[PDB]
Amino acid sequence: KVSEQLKCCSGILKEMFAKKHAAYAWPFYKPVDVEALGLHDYCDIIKHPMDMSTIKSKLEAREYRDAQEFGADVRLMFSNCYKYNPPDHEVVAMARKLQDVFEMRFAKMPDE
Ligand SMILES: COc1cc2c(cc1-c1c(C)noc1C)[nH]c1ccnc(-c3c(C4CC4)n[nH]c3C)c12
Numbered sequence: 586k587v588s589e590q591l592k593c594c595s596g597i598l599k600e601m602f603a604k605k606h607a608a609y610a611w612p613f614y615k616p617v618d619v620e621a622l623g624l625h626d627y628c629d630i631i632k633h634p635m636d637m638s639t640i641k642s643k644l645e646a647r648e649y650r651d652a653q654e655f656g657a658d659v660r661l662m663f664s665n666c667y668k669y670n671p672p673d674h675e676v677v678a679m680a681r682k683l684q685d686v687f688e689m690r691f692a693k694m695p696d697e
Pocket residue numbers: 611612613616617618622624665666667669670675676
């Protein structure tokens with residue numbers, strides 16, 4: 586059950602990195618570079634940054650013991666985006682689209 590769940594997690598993350606979703610996924614590929622983007626309030630607002638490359642590294646290191654922990658990091662990544670940015674920002678619209686990709690497939694997680 587757990588190994589199967591973690592293969593589903595790995596599949597979902599590989600899809601989120603696929604070219605077909607890249608026009609909206611790309612801001613989530615790497616950690617937010619606070620200095621490069623001039624976001625001098627980012628760390629005052631976001632206490633736990635997360636991004637897709639960090640999630641990939643944690644899967645590769647077998648840090649997630651089950652799908653719930655993996656899902657919590659994916660949601661943390663999106664929640665940080667919804668917390669920091671104005672609700673009408675282009676990046677929030679991109680987040681909603683990538684989160685729909687994620688939620689619809691994560692809902693199909695094997696359950697036994
Ligand atoms: C505005 O939010 C981001 C922009 C970029 C990013 C992360 C975020 C981000 C996420 C996710 N959640 O919160 C924040 C903050 N990472 C990049 C790397 C390079 N350029 C860009 C870029 C963009 C992106 C289309 C939105 N607009 N203008 C530039 C300079 C970004």
